[model samples]
Each structure stands twice: as structure tokens, then as C-alpha cells.
Target: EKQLMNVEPIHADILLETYKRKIADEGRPFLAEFQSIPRVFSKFPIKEARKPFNQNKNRYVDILPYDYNRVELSEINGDAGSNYINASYIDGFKEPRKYIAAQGPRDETVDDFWRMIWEQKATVIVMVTRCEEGNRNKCAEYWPSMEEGTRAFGDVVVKINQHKRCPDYIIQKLNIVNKKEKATGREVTHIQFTSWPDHGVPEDPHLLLKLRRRVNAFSNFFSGPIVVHSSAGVGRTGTYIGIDAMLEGLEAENKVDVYGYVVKLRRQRCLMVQVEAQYILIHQALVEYNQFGETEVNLSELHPYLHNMKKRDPPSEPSPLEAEFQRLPSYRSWRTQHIGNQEENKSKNRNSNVIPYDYNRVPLKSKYINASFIMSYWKPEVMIAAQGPLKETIGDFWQMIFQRKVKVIVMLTELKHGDQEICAQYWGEGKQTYGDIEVDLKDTDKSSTYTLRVFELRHSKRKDSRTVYQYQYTNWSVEQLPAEPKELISMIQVVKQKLPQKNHKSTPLLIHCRDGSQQTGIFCALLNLLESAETEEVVDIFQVVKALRKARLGMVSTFEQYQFLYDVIASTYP
Candidate 1:
């Protein structure tokens, strides 16, 4: 019933294939499709927004909400024009007034924004733009600061109770009450998507979908419309609304009408999805959502989920965990630009297929190294995932360590697994030199499962020298996990303890396995997931590994390793 006559219904089964084809068209079709969409689908007047008296209320002069569905504010002090606010009630795929897409609040309109929230009883506010972008004022600082705690936006007293900073976005719990009415305050969840760029879509479409899931999870069913905004309220705002609605359409009707939905959205407001790239992002995000549906697992339910995964028949077919691992986006399928694939850096890589992405590769002052700058839970370039040093590339490895000022080195694979050299012995018992860097092995602490070694690294150019610790986990193999998860967990704790307490001046932790992305991936993921579980009480293994694979190819590379991640978490929690 939701399908249009001429347009083909993109079923969830073939969504990925469809997306690949569209992307392969060099975005020509996407651009033409977006350009072909009528800017304004209705003859409804936007005269109120264009009025001279209401000019200041509008963020951009050209971007005005249509009069037919524009959110009407309650009149203040008998002023009829007080009803005007740069916001529109967008009809979702199935639900009317499901969202209110508005322009980002300006200084003067901040109070009006709060009044609208109070009147409409909106429980959630999704901010997609920053207060400033590209040294220009994109949006006003509408919310009160965390230090200030509370601020009076006219009659509405908005209080920031608490806010949690995640890697990509921020979640703030706010209390809003009308001082004049003295009524009990309402709780509002304010989500600010900080990763989205003003010019284009997110680098990863999964991140945007994750933001949508977070918004939906926090939203109250009985509450008013979810207020979504960008600087102009049409570009990023409309794209978000389009994705949110189209996802619902997919769920309810088992099909998505992105073109049809955007047509409806533009009919309600002007230029909802502003760019072709953003339009493509909507389709891409839907495809990703279909691929990985609801990946986040709560701590309490993880046990049962893992148990069920184990209970599933293994002899007849791939286990649930194996199937899930196979479903993961591979390096070849997702990323095509590998700097290590170049002829110049080919000799540096341990394996031809295992290479660092050009985007996140650690650019050394001297030369290239098969290493990637991986992000921590909330920090950028706090960790580096690298292949085990080759005999020829040992100098490059040490150069990376010295140049990047890495404080901790985590070795997940032994130098040899059997007769094969899994990794090169990069250091020795005494002082050793690789290129201009002199590494002095100071101390070695041996354990049943791992060895902790301390080294003083001195560069020839710089007079200063620094100490670095290497926690080489011996029990882990090339593709196999440790016999006991506790050993790995303990090693992680030791590494954490070795890290500097002063986080501001913290250095990147170098983690490497044989080819860098099997056990190395598990170690890095476990480190992040352990911290995430402790802090957020929930872990998204799928997204964590997906993000990791983006930084470096073949992270959490196998089904066994993927299942081991869940097992390790379960063991740690239980």
C-alpha cells in the first residue's frame, strides 16, 4: 500500500545491493534525483515568515517555514505575531505531528524556543548543529551551561540536571518548569549530535542511525513531538526526520518510500533534505539499519543472549554468533582506499590485505608504518592499532613510537605461534637501537599469562627521553582467544594502571598482533567495552567492532574472536 506506481519499493533484503549500485553510479543519479524533487510541493503561503516584523525570528531569509503547517506559538501580551516561530509540524510516515523540524535558536529566539517547548510539551530535543562551525555562528547557545545549572528563558526555568558525553554525541537530562504557573517540572532529554559536519553527511552512516536509535529510545510515547533542529532546520534536520520516518515506514510496511517521504516533507516545509549527499545518506542509513538491527545489548540481558547464542545448533549450520560475524562489513566491502596498498608502503605491511586506512593512518615524520590511529571511547587518537613489527620495518615501528610519544605498547601475539614468525623481536634485554631511536629495556616482570617490560626510549634529535611499558600477552594466539578471559582482563587493568593519571597529556597506547587486527582488535574492543560497560551499563559490540574495522581492516576478524568478545564481557560481569 505504501508503494508508489512508478517507483520500485526497495525491500530490506536488497537494500545493500541497491545502495551499492547507487553509490557506483558516481552519485550522478543521486544528484539528479535530489534536484528533480520539487522544492516546494504545495502552493501554501509562507507570508507570515516573510513579514518584516518576523524577519528576525527566521535564521535564514530564504529558508522559511510554510504557513500551512508552521508551529504556531501562543500569543504573548496580546501580540498576534508572537505565534510565529521558525518551526514546522512534519507528518511522519504514519504518524501526524511526529516531529517538529525547526531552525537552530538564535539569541533573541531562545526564549521563544523554550516557550514553544513548554507549550508543546516536547520531551526530547535533537540538536544536529554546533553553536559554531567553520569560525561562523551557526547556532546560538540556547541551553544553560553545566556550571550555571539553571537559567530563566523568560518564564520557563530550564535546569541541566546531568549530561553524559559519549564518543559521538551528548545526552543531557534537563528539567523545565514554568515559574509563573509553579507547576511540577517536566523532564526533557536533550541530545546533541556533535559529529555531523555542516557541509556533508557523517563519515559513517551507522553513526547517524545510532543517534536515531538513541533519540527513539529516550523519546516518550505519550509526549509531544520530538523537536529536531539544525542551523537552517531544513538540511540536516530534514534529513534526520526523513531517515526517522522512512525507518518507521520500513518497519511498519516492510518497505521504504524515501522519495515519497521527502516529497511529503518538502510539501510541509521548504528544502527539508537540502543536499544530494544527505539524501543519499538517508538511503544508506536505512540500508545499514536493515543490516544491523538493534545491536546494543544491555548488561543484564547479555548473559541470556550469549547463552542463546551458545544454545543454537552448531553442527547443522553456522551458529548465531558465526552468522553475526559473517554479517559484519568486511574491509574489502566497506573501504576501498588503503594507503598501505600503494607500492611505496607495500613492503612495510606484514600482510598484503592488512593495511591502515588513509584517513586514520599515523603519518610519521620519517616514513610510513603499517599502523592506524584508533580512537578511545571519548578521546581521539588515544590508541594505535598496528601490525607486529617486521625485521625491515622495526625502525618505522620505533619511529612511530618515538614520534607519537606512545606510553604503552600492548602485544597480543607472540613472536612465533609455531615455526612461523608471528612477530619480530623488536627489543632486547639491554639497550638496542632501531634507526635514531635507542630503546633501553629497564625491567621485565614475568607472569603466568603475560610479561610486562619497561623501556626508556631516547631519540637522537631530542635530548629528552621517556619511559614506555609493553604488556605482551603471551597466551593469546594469531586467531584464537585466551584460555581464560580473566588473564586478558587483568592485563587490560595493568595497562590502565600504567597509563598516566593526567589524561590531558596522555599518549597513544600501541596495540599490535601478528597482522594487527585479530587479537589486537579484541584487546582494543575489550578495553573500550569494559570501560563502556562500567560507565554506561550497556555495550554495543557490533558498533564498536564496526568502528574499529573502519580505522583498520579486519578488526575482530573472525567469528571465534567476535564470540570471545561477548564471552569475555560475560566473564568480567559475572
Candidate 2:
């Protein structure tokens, strides 16, 4: 008789409400429930892990795997500790030994790590920690560099056939062969998640879920247990396993028993879900996944989806594209706290109402400036979206440029529109000083649609100076797009190419328009979405706009602007 019963999926709103209530009760219930979990169960013996010879193989002496459920490696030349590896077999939602929670490979255990993968037939390895963090060694280097392409570990030869860097993670397609068995080569997927902090969770749970979804897509159900590891293999590894299991649990039973499942994990592997914050993260990730269900659309399906979006079902009603635009989270709804709205910072903003959020607004080293840091799909603070400088704030703008080491400035508006002064003339013909920074115009390359100006920026107080490239796109107006997408596309390419290869992450590209959120928003969103389509063959326009709004309010301000995003993508993608 079948024991499992089919149940409807849990409603995200109800589950989220329950979570909020429990968390709001002074966190008493949540704390007590987490504290009640046993760190280690008495039934499992860990004698083998305690053996002197095997002690050196473990990354953390305190984070040893239980003997009963630990993964056993095949002995080599009758060696004493050859069979011991710091790894434990973990059960999934309803499947036994579906995952192997292992430590990040130690310097001495790299060979043994590959041997375990070979023995278990595991085809997916999820690495959740960097090789080093804060100048401290976390995970030892186990894989070969992409340039080298291949490495030998004991009798196993692992070759990187292909690799791609996504926004949040790196995916390496590897080919593994065992010379001892003379077996045919097998393909493996190695994903290294680079976003998680050393001892903390990701800033955004959506990013974690996106990584999880990628792992699920690459994993094969029929293959061996998927290998997951962090530094000690318990904190991040266990949290990832918990999320994977709980998500499946919700799908199968319409409920997730996080406390119960975590307890079961501890029984097999001590200290699974290591910290309280990690435990809370599992719940948050589940809630996010259930709420937003799979928002990404693969490149293959985008054409058809875009076509459908443009079609109007009824003549009088709005098109699907317009409906999607209207459904976006409004500025008031998303902008919970506005730091730029403070009394002192009011004058810095060009528009009275348009302001930056407290969380991501870029602070000038000297004082306040109306500029918000924007994140690309891959890297954080890759760009800064700022308002066109007002006369009073021009000095503050130069201060920000010098302090932030901004290399690229993209202006999408003109100084004057018809009879009105839309933006201030912040720079002069040859040399000018704004506050403590001196700007010298080096060269000008003027095209029909845009003008490229190279300026040498120096601080009056410091000896060091930097070059800043300003790409002023003249074709685009306040609320309207350019006549054609070709010029804008070319400008984006040129800006990307001009970005310094060294310290690119620290040197953010500066983009500004009239209010800082409309044309600025369109350019930022287009650059990120286009890059995503090129790299991953996927696009999430809704998520892109949503992420932008989270960083700064009123991004991609109108339905027409939003639709132009699709039009640009439709033109450039093919």
C-alpha cells in the first residue's frame, strides 16, 4: 500500500503570515523551538572520526560526521585512513541518501574527495564557500583553473569541458574519468556559489533561491547523491539541504516541518543547520520561492512570450504588456524608507518627491549626495544611478565622483530641454574646479546621436588623479527613448569596453538623467538584461525592474518606458 498522499501546495500568504506572527511574538516561540533541537543524537557512533589517523582529514575537529551514515571511501593500498572522508549521507524529502554533506576539501584530502565522488557516482557538486574569506583559508583548491582545464586526483582525471559565470554562481561542466577502473568518462556539473558571506546568509533570499533553482535544473534524479559543501560543511551545506528538502516537502505534503526535518538531519550529521540565522534563512527562502514561483524565462521562450505580451486580447482593454507594467510594485509600496527625504538632504535632490532609499543610497565621503548605488545582475554596486546635478549639488557630485573613483559617467539627458534648464552645466570647456576636485577635459568625440568626453579628474587635496569617461547620449530625452536602439546599444558596448579591467567592481559606472530613476532606470535595466540573455540565455524583465526599484525608487517610471525595454531586448537578443 502507498503511504504518501497527494496534497495541494501550501498557500504562500498563509505560511508567510504564520511566520510573521511567530517572529513577532518577541521571537519567543521561534527561539525556544530552535533551542530545543538536540545538537547530536545518542544513537549514532563517531568512533572512526575520532581515530588519530582520520583526524587530520577532517576540516573542523568538532564537525565530524557520524560513523553510521558517513560516506566511506575505498581503501588505497591497504592504507589505514584511506577509507575515511569527512562526509555524511543526508536524506532528502522522502528519499534516502539523496545528498552528501561534505566539508570543503582540505589540502591533504583533495585526492580523497574525488575518490568519494567517483565511488558514489555523484554527478553534481555544490560549493557554497569561497576558497578564501577575509584573507583566511576556507576551502582548499580542489578543481583546476579554467585556463589549465584539467587535473588529476589519485586515479581520477577531471577535465573542465566548458564553464560559464552567471550573475550569482559559476557553472563548470566537467568530464571525470577513473584510470583504475578504466571506465568511460562521465559528465559532472560543479556549481560554486560566490554570494554567501563567510558566517552569514545572503542579503537577498531570492538570490539563494535562484542558485537553488539552477542546481535543481542541473541535477539528475537517477544519479548518485548530490555533494554539497561549505567551509565546515554544516552551516551553509545543511541550510541548503534543508531548503531543498523543505521545498520538496511543501510540494508533496502541503506542509514543511522545518524543526522536525532539521532534527532528523542532526541525528545523521551533527550540527546540521549550524546557526540560528541559518535556520531562519531556510524558512525565509521557502516563503520567497513559494511567493514568486519561477520568474525567469529562458531565451528560447522569450520571443513567443514577448509576442503574446504585445497582443491585445480585447480591442478596448490594455495589452498583456501594459497589464504587466501596471502590476509592478508602485514606488510608495516598495520604498519603505527614504533617507534622501530627510530635512538636511532635501536640497541635494533635484526633484522634491524623487529620492533614494536609505539602504542603498551612496554616501559621499564628505557629505550627502543624491545618488543611489545600483547592482548589476552579477555584481553588487556595479553602477550608480544619480540625478542630473543641480547648481548647488554640482560640487557634491564631483566629490562623489572623486571619492567613489567613478570611471564611466553616462548622461542620458541634456542640460536644457527647450526653454527650461533640465540639468546644470557641471563641467567647463578645458579645466574647472568643483569643490575639492579639479576636472580637465582631455578630448571630445562627438557623434550624431551621442558625445564622448574624456576628463582627467584630480583631488585638490590628494596627488593621485583618475580618468573619467562621459558618454552623453543626446538622442534620448526625459521620458522618451531614442528613435532607434542601435545607437544606445553601441554606446553600451563602448562603455563596457572602456571600463578598467582592474578594480572594476569598486569603480562603479555612473548613470544619470533628469530625475535619476526614469532614463537612468531604462539604461541600467537594459544593460543587465542584455548581459543576462548573452550569458545564460535567459531573461527576467520583471525581476530586473523589481531589483532596480529595491535599490532606488521610481526606476523605469512608465509603461511606455517598460515596453521599450522589451523592444530593445527583442531587437538586440536575436
Candidate 3:
């Protein structure tokens, strides 16, 4: 109380950033020190998955909680006494603990998962990742569907009365009834995020912020620790638990040491914040929390959550701009700009307008050709991420090039991938014509994975001239991600080598792929993070993805792709 009294409610980052710099400068050494710190359960045969003594209980051999704090399953009703959940008693910011971190439940251990919940009287369960990602089964479904059916995991029967979906998460209202006791009945709030990837981080902190609020509001009505989990339990689980702890500590002392805190976390739980990206994400989320200014969780709206779970139409009367924009005309002139059609050349249909349209243009706005200007995590209009040109939109593609005066082109797609044609070879070793525009492929150079070509573009009547360098990646395919990320990183380096060193608006670089959104979105995100890091001390992938998705739909495409971006950034720094 004395320390907090004199603290004057410090803006968390004031002290948080001090630790942030200490961490950035000595990260490599600091991480080494973190790993060297001895863990509590230094020696334990907690993973012997044998019969009655040890069965399918633990998720990993090396990662286990301290025996004293480990939650034990009761030896009753077809249950083995040694059916231990691979979970640890994580210490809170200051108190004993308000939570437990554990691995996702397996099919065999699904019954054990419920036993732990029922025994602990835990009223909240926070699941962060999807049930499956990248074709791998991440967890077992332990709860029942809304209003129908019941899942009996041994003596406990779980039923879902209601569920609701938010932008970044899903919340469920559950009723847990114990068949053996008959009189035992408890209500649980099951919260899960729809975006966070296993062993990866989320694009922004907003989803987590709202989730934390809702959890806090519901948790206040209960007395026990909240149970949280991800697939292997160490990475994403740790990241979330650490953030919540830091937020609590910051409020009281107005001070924090993220590196020191995480090291302590590892002593209680093995490999908390396992990867570099997860480590960086915790820091980024804390700084964002400080910047947003604290707000009380609005329990008023959440009070009726059980009843509000049902789907319903919008309010009776709709007014204002959003309503009009919802029903407005489509923006882009053509629908099938990239895909080759059996129709005539579409150059006559395109309007040669260079200026960007307004925001309220509705379908008319998002309807524009597949190409759109994308921004950096914190900067504006850094580059254009466009779809590959088709035979019909060839002239319009060139016109955009001349209008925007693009200086560099980064192509992540092949001219032809597998059996499908991805892009048109508009210009070759010499001059070529696509209706009104003239293109001359001046020279070519080759690398291990990418090809670079310099081109001279000229307008027919205007007589305007512009030189552009187009980089083509030969290794990337439509079916899968790059075999090796090092090649993509090097390809980005080559793109950097061609650009000026100083940062300013000269001409926006052009980044394109066959599908427009998926691969190209990943490329743009990687490039943005790289460039932004050069200038800014701290870069947030969530901020970058959010900004990019605003400009172009499907930026940073999938959770797996998002994780890959984090790996690329971590590899560069680590």
C-alpha cells in the first residue's frame, strides 16, 4: 500500500518501456539467461504414460508442473488416479494464483479435462486457438452444442445453453452437471478465440482486450482460478497468462520488468513465451494497453449475455452513412480483371482515373480492380499489393503503372504455377504492345529463387516514359507455402537493394501475386515489418496486419501464414 500510494498511478509504459529497451539491447543474452534459469520440476517422471500409475495423462515428456501443485484426478468411475493433466500452477502478479495454464485436451484425456474443471470449481475456461490448424488436430471438443445434446465425460455431463461470436473470439454459456452427485450443478463461461494460431501470435491486441474485459466481468461473479489452454500449453497459453499478470502488476506498482517477469514465469511453467515472436507479442500487447488508456469492463451489456446469444436482425430503423454504404453500388469497374475470359479486350471499358475514391462508395469502393494501395504498420501508402494481370486487364495494368509511376515490382507468384496459368508474359526480352501502352524488357538477371527484369514503359499519345524493375519469384507455388523462408527473405533483400536508402515518398513499390490476397498479403506484411523495423524501435504485427487488411481484404491471409510471418521476423532479429 505504501509503495502504490507514492506511485501516483504511473502510465504502465513509462516503466514498461524502460524494461522494453533493456530487453531489446540485450535480448540474445537475456534469452540465454532465461533458459539457464533452473525450473522447479527439474527432475520428475510425470510423463510416464503407462497404466493405472501413469496413462495418457501428460502431453509432453519434459514439460510438467511441480508435483505438489499439480492438479490430481480422483480415482473413481472408470478413472485412473494417475490421469494427471499436463498443467502447472502459474503464480499470479502478486497473489498465489487466479489461474492455471494447461495443454489442450486429447481424445483419450477428454474425461480428465472435465474432472480437473469440476474438482477446482473453475468457472471460466479460456481457449485461444482453433480446434485445428494447418490440418493438425489441436484439441478435443469437450462441450455440447447449443440447446441440444449433452457430452458426458465420465461422471460429468456438459451442455451448452447458448453461444455468441465476436470479431476475434467466441463466448459460450455452459451448464455443467455431475451425474454421480445428481445435485451438483455449475455454470461455466467458455471463451475461445477464432484467430490466434497455435505456437503463433495474433495480428492485433484489440481482440484480447475485449476478451479480457468479458472474462473479468464474468470472473468477478466466481471465486476460483480461470483455466486457460492452447495446444501444447506453453507458448500461446503463456503469452496470454503473462500479459494478464503484467496488466495487474502495472496497475498496483505503476512499474514492470517483462524480461524478469517472464524468467520467473518459466520457473513455475516450462518454456513460457517459447518463441521469439511470442516474447515480442507480450511486450507489444502491454505497450498497447498503456496507450489505449484503461477503461472499466462494461458489464452492463454483458449482464444479459445468456439471453443475447441468439441470432437476430439489426434494429428496426437504420439511418446514416453506414446504412447507405451497406446497400450502395460496387466500386471496382470490372469483376474478372485477373482471370482470363473468352471476351474481347476490356481496355475500352476502364476509366483512366488515377485519384482514389471516397470511403462511403460502398460495394462501389471495394469493387475496384483487385489492386489496392496498402500501408505500413504505422505509415501510410507504403506500397501497392495487386493481383497479377490477365490478358483482358493488361492495358489497364500498364496504365496504373504509368499513372502511379511505380519504381519497383515484387512478384511473389509464378507466371505459371502447376497446370494453371497465373500471370501473362506481357513483355519479354524486347518491346511489346498491349493495346495503347508500349513495354520494353530491357535486361534480365537471375538468382537462385527469383528473376529480375528491368523494363521501360511508354504511353502511346502522352509520350511519357518510366523505368521499372520487376522481380519474379520462381520457387513459390499456388498449392503450398515456400519450402524455405530464407529464400523469400533474401528475395526481399534484393528488392531492398534496388530501392533508395532514405525513407520518403518517391514512388510506391508494386507487390503482386496470382491470387492477389493470400501470398501477396504475406509478402507485403513481411516487407512492411522489415522496413518498419529499420526506422521504429518496436513493430507490432497486429498493428501491421490490421492496417493492411483495412486497405485490402485478406491481407496476412491465414493464421498459419500469419505465424510464418512472425517466424520470418524472429529469424531476422534472433
Best by TM-score: 1
Overall lDDT per candidate, in order of appearance: 0.83, 0.82, 0.64
Of candidate 3, the 10-residue stretch with the lowest lDDT total is: 1-10
RMSD of each: 3.2, 4.1, 18.9
- Comparing 1 with 2 on lDDT, the higher-scoring candidate is 1
* C-alpha TM-score for every candidate: 0.92, 0.89, 0.52
lDDT at residue 160 of model 2 (Cα atoms): 92
lDDT tens string, model 2, 92-167? 9878999999999999989999998888999999999899999988999888888898888888999998888876
Runs of candidate 1 with Cα error greater than 4 angstroms are 1-6, 219-222, 313-315, 333-361, 415-421, 461-463, 501-507
Model 2 alpha-carbon drift over 4 Å, by segment: 1-11, 75-77, 80-82, 134-136, 219-222, 309-339, 342-345, 378-381, 430-432, 440-445, 456-467, 504-508
State the lDDT at 265 in candidate 3.
Answer: 77
Clashes of each: 0, 0, 10
In model 3, the runs with Cα more than 4 Å from the true position are 1-52, 77-83, 294-574
Rank by lDDT (best first)? 1, 2, 3
